[PDB]
Amino acid sequence: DVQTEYYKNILTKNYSALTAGAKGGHFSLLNIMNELKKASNHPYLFDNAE
Amino acid sequence: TRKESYAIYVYKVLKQVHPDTGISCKAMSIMNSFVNDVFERIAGEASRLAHYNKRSTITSREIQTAVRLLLPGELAKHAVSEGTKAVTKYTSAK
Amino acid sequence: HRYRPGTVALREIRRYQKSTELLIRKLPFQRLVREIAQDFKTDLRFQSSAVMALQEASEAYLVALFEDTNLCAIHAKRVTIMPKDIQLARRIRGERA
Amino acid sequence: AKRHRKVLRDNIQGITKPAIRRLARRGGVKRISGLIYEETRGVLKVFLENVIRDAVTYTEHAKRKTVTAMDVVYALKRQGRTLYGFGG
Amino acid sequence: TRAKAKTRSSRAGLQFPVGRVHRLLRKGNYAERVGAGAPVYLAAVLEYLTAEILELAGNAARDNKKTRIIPRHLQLAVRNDEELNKLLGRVTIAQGGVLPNIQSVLLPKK
DNA sequence: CACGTACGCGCTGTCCCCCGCGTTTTAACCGCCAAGGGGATTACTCCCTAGTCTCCAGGCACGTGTCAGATATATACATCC
| Chain F bases near protein CB atoms (7 A cut-off) | 4-9, 17-19, 28, 35-40, 49-51, 56-62
Strand-pair category, E33-34 with B57-58: parallel
Whether CB of B50 is under 7 Å from strand F: the answer is no
B22 phi/psi in degrees, rounded to 5: -90, -170
Tell me the one-letter amino acid at E96.
G
- Cα–Cα distance measured from residue D28 to residue A10, given in angstroms and rounded to the nearest whole number: 52
User: Domains of chain C by range and CATH?
Assistant: 1-97 (1.10.20.10)
A12 residue type, one letter: T
**By the CB < 8 Å criterion, does D52 face chain B?**
no
E4 C-beta less than 7 Å away from strand F? yes
- Residues A4, E106: Cα–Cα separation, whole Å: 68
Output the CA angle A39-A43-A44, nearest 5 degrees: 135
On whether the CB atoms of residues E22 and E41 are closer than 8 A, the answer is no
Cβ of C10 near strand F (distance < 7 A)? no
Check CB contact under 8 Å for B60 and E73. no
Cα distance between residue A40 and residue A34, in whole Å: 10
**How far is C13 from E108, CA to CA, in rounded Å?**
13
Domain boundaries, chain D: 1-88
Architecture of domain D1-88: Orthogonal Bundle (1.10)
> E33 forms bridges with which residues in the sheet?
B57
- B35/E contact by beta carbon, under 8 A: yes
CB C68, CB C88: distance < 8 Å: no
Q: Which nucleotide is nearest to C78 (CA to C1')?
A: F8
Whether A28 CB is under 7 Å from strand F: no
Q: Is the CB of C83 under 7 A from strand F?
A: no
Inter-residue long-range contacts of C75-82, CB under 8 Å, 24+ positions, other chains counted? C79/E105, C79/E106
Our answer on whether A and D touch (3+ beta-carbon pairs < 8 Å) is yes
Residues 19-78 of E with CB under 8 A from C: 71-72, 75
* DSSP H helices in A1-50: 2-11, 15-19, 32-41
Query: How is D19-74 classified by DSSP, letter by letter?
Result: HHHHHHHHTT-S---TTHHHHHHHHHHHHHHHHHHHHHHHHHHTT-SS--HHHHHH
What type of residue sits at position D56?
V
E104 touches chain C (CB under 8 A): no
Task: Name residue B58's beta-bridge partners.
Answer: E34
Q: Does D32 touch chain B (CB under 8 A)?
A: no
Per the entry, the structure determination technique was cryo-EM
| Chains interfacing with B (3 or more CB pairs < 8 Å) | D, E
* E strand or H helix that includes residue E4: none
| Dihedral-angle region of residue A25 (phi above 0 means left; psi in -120 to 50 means alpha; beta otherwise) | left
Radius of gyration of chain B (CA): 16
Question: For residues D72 and A25, what is the distance between their CA atoms, to the nearest angstrom?
Answer: 26
Nearest neighbour of E46 by CB, restricted to B38, B74, B75: B38
Chains C, E: CB contacts under 8 A, how many? 39
Residue E54 to residue D4: CA distance in whole angstroms: 53
